[PDB]
């Protein structure tokens, strides 16, 4: 039954920088993590945005439009957990 030990955090980032959100999750079985930004499922497809190991989401060449509410979802057949944080790009 999944539980988020450390969720993403509030940050101010510079434009053109690289930042991450991380979501450390425990449970059984190992909880898969997803990312939503402003209620919508983040597109790893856009090649700035990278789902890396140990539940990290990374965003390179930061843009003003990356400001928003990023949410971590940790999921198991049992259930899911939520933890969100706010990113401000300037």
């Amino acid at each position: 039954g999944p539980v988020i030990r450390q969720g993403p955090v509030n940050q101010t980032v510079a434009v053109d920088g690289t930042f991450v959100l991380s979501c450390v999750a425990t449970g059984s079985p190992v909880p898969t993590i997803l990312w939503r930004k402003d209620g919508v499922l983040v597109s790893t497809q856009d090649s700035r945005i990278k789902q890396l190991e140990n539940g990290v989401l990374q965003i390179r060449y930061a843009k003003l439009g990356d400001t928003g509410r990023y949410t971590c979802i940790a999921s198991t057949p049992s259930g899911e957990a939520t933890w969100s944080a706010y990113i401000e790009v300037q």
Partner: antibody, heavy 122, light 108 residues
Framework: EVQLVESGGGVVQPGGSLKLSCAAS????????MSWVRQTPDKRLELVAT????????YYPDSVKGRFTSSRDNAKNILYLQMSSLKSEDTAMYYC???????????????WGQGTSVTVSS | LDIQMTQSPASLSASVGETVTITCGAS??????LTWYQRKQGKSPQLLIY???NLADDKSSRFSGSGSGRQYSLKISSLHPDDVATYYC?????????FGSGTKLEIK
């Protein structure tokens, strides 16, 4: 055979300008992000510029922001770094490096050029 | 605000055939977003490890990268004379993408 080849280094006065080149061949230059990294006499290293495939995104650390401009030319395969307001702490060997294509897609540089020497003062 | 990478030791001399560990510390948890480079004298660096644990393609398995969280290590097994170089770890989590100062590996 992949080749990266920096030119245009040399000695300049404090406050001066410089324009470095990097000729690339033996790979698809238009597919890759490139980096500019330097090496101070103390043997420390420091990433100073990154540029993306088509040249539409650039990043610079605080130490060189505003003074360093990076640009590319994907027709003739060259990478440039323009340096102005140059300071003594910019004396360094400058490398042209390629961004690897990986899984998971971490930032790593798989190929480096052999560098061009840059010195600042008197 | 910037993320420190510290490298232990500064330098060391050891003997052929030995195993030798170089450690890299981050002022914060960098989630294995860490890369290793080898620089021989008069040469540009070369990628050794990426993502903390993944070995580069045309590089000797004598090299192993390990670690998680704040603490990382590079082990060189059965020391060869061609391993003489400086080794540098780098934070590729968030910018600035700082390098550790590096570690000069010498043979006795």
């Amino acid at each position: 055979e992949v080749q990266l080849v920096e030119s245009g280094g040399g000695v300049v006065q404090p406050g001066g300008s410089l324009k470095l080149s990097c000729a690339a061949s033996g790979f698809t230059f238009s597919t890759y992000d490139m980096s500019w990294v330097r090496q101070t006499p103390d043997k420390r290293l420091e990433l100073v510029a990154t540029i993306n495939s088509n040249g539409g995104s650039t990043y610079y650390p605080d130490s060189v922001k505003g003074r360093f401009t990076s640009s590319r030319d994907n027709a003739k395969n060259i990478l440039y770094l323009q340096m102005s307001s140059l300071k003594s702490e910019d004396t360094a060997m400058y490398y042209c490096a390629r961004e690897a294509l990986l899984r998971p897609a971490y930032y790593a540089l798989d190929y480096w050029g052999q560098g061009t020497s840059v010195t600042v003062s008197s | 605000l910037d993320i420190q990478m510290t490298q232990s030791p500064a330098s060391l001399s050891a003997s052929v055939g030995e195993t030798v560990t170089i450690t890299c510390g981050a002022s914060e948890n960098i989630y294995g977003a860490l890369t290793w480079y080898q620089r021989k004298q008069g040469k540009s660096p070369q990628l050794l490890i990426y993502g903390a644990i993944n070995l580069a393609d045309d590089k000797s398995s004598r090299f192993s990268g390990s670690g998680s969280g704040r603490q990382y290590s590079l082990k060189i097994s059965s020391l060869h004379p061609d391993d003489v170089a400086t080794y540098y770890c780098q934070n590729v989590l968030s910018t600035p993408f700082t390098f550790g100062s590096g570690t000069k590996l010498e043979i006795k």
